């Protein structure tokens, strides 16, 4: 039911947003690879999880990403209902 138009951007959406965490860690008052697993984990409802953002602002980026997980997969499994 999901067209390839949305697939490409959402697939690349996680990659371009995970890097901002380590970028934000530069001026904080955990390598880049060790921080990217978090975002892909959030969406996939996975059981693998370790390491959390340390800076206060980095949590906000992780915070807003949490809401994106709930809206997509739940609504995606609502279109199939019809």
């Amino acid at each position: 039911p999901f067209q390839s138009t949305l697939w490409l951007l959402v697939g690349l959406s996680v990659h371009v947003v995970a890097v901002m965490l380590y970028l934000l860690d530069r001026f904080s008052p955990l390598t880049l690879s060790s921080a990217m697993w978090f975002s892909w984990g959030v969406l996939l409802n996975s059981g693998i999880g370790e390491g959390a953002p340390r800076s206060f602002s980095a949590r906000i980026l992780g915070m807003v990403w949490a809401g994106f997980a709930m809206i997509i997969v739940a609504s995606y499994t609502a279109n199939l209902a019809a």
Binding site: V17, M20, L24, F27, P29, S55, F56, S57, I60, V64
Partner: peptide
């Protein structure tokens, strides 16, 4: 507005860090 909210809060800790 996510990063826009992040960048404006990015300098918020800079104020505490620099003062």
């Amino acid at each position: 507005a996510a990063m826009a909210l992040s960048l404006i809060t990015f300098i918020s800790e800079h104020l505490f860090y620099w003062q």
